[PDB]
Amino acid sequence: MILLDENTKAIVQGITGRQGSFHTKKMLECGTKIVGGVTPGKGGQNVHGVPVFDTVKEAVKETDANASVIFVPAPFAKDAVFEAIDAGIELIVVITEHIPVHDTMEFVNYAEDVGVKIIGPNTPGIASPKVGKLGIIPMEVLKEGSVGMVSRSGTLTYEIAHQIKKAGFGVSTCVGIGGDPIVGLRYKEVLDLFEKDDETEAIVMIGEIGGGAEEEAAKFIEKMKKPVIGYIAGQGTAESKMKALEEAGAYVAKNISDIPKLLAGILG
Numbered sequence: 438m439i440l441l442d443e444n445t446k447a448i449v450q451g452i453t454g455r456q457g458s459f460h461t462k463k464m465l466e467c468g469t470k471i472v473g474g475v476t477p478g479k480g481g482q483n484v485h486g487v488p489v490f491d492t493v494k495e496a497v498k499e500t501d502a503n504a505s506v507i508f509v510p511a512p513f514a515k516d517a518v519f520e521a522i523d524a525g526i527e528l529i530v531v532i533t534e535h536i537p538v539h540d541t542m543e544f545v546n547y548a549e550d551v552g553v554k555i556i557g558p559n560t561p562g563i564a565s566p567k568v569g570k571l572g573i574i575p576m577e578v579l580k581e582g583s584v585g586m587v588s589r590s591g592t593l594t595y596e597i598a599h600q601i602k603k604a605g606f607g608v609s610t611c612v613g614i615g616g617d618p619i620v621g622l623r624y625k626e627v628l629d630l631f632e633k634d635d636e637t638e639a640i641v642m643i644g645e646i647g648g649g650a651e652e653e654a655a656k657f658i659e660k661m662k663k664p665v666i667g668y669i670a671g672q673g674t675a676e677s678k679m680k681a682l683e684e685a686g687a688y689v690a691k692n693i694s695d696i697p698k699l700l701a702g703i704l705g
Contacts, residue, residue: 440528440556440565440610440612440634441528441563441568441610443568444503445568445571446472446500446503446504447469447470447471447502447505448471448475448500448504449473449474449475449506449508450474450506450507451509452476452484452487452508453474453476453479453484453489454508454509454510456532457508458485460532461484461485462485463576464506464570464571465485468569469568472488472501472502473487473499474487474496475496476489477491477492478491479491493505493520493524502526503526503527504530504571505526505528506562506571507529510533511533511534511536514531514540515537515540515541518544519543519547522547522551527552528553528556529553529555529556530557530562531555531556531557531615532559532562532572533558534558535559541558549621554622554626556622557613557617557621558615558617559615559616559617560613561613562612562613563610563612564576564610565610567609567636574611575595579598579602579608580602580607580608582606582609583607583608583704584637585608585609585612585631585640586598586608586640586643587624587628587631587641587643588614588642589615589616589644589650590613590643593670594643596693597668597696598611600697601641601696604701606704609631609636624644624657625654628640631663637663638703638704639665639700639704640664640665640666641665641666641668642654642665642682642687643668643669644668644678645669645671645675646669646670646671652677652678652681655687656685658682658685659685665682665687665688666687666689667679667688668690668695668696669689688703
């Protein structure tokens with residue numbers, strides 16, 4: 438029951454690509470333990486000091502990596518995820534957008550049976566100020582703290598994170614579950630992980646209209662020990678989600694400005 442922590446040793450698949458190289462630089466800059474990269478035919482090289490391997494198996498061998506962040510283009514992403522799963526990697530963050538849904542369904546199914554954690558696809562990833570990030574989340578809007586954040590949106594999450602930080606609060610772990618129709622870990626799994634994360638004292642759950650992801654997580658919130666603040670953008674409907682969250686015991690923020698106010702009441 439662990440996501441990103443001090444024991445994380447990650448590899449970057451698609452490390453030589455433009456996006457992979459740039460984000461590897463930014464991940465290194467915030468202290469992320471990136472121990473290797475993978476790009477067929479680039480073995481032996483290095484990107485921003487990180488050693489490149491031709492395959493995940495080779496990379497895992499020399500580094501004992503237990504996590505991977507994937508930037509591989511959509512047509513080749515499924516094979517990259519299977520490669521990471523085949524190699525024993527337990528946490529796989531899939532940044533790539535536009536992966537054919539049947540491809541995603543295949544790797545999400547394989548991973549769940551094996552017990553691997555897939556974050557995404559089409560997600561900015563995960564960020565934990567204390568140890569770094571796996572993905573593209575802007576660390577400028579986060580500072581070390583005890584607020585756990587889970588969302589399935591992009592920009593909105595940063596706007597909210599910005600307001601939270603400006604109000605003086607820090608984040609333990611921020612996780613984006615992804616914006617595609619089929620994804621890996623859902624709200625419930627992330628909330629469960631937050632419940633068992635000593636670094637997390639309060640949770641900010643960000644949703645929006647459409648789907649039933651928030652409604653399904655409401656069931657779990659009912660038995661959670663840690664306080665949950667819920668915010669739904671776009672006020673299946675926003676009202677339906679706010680009602681389900683409120684009935685489950687979550688504290689519903691009507692406006693983003695209410696989130697820091699509730700955190701002040703909960704955390705001081």
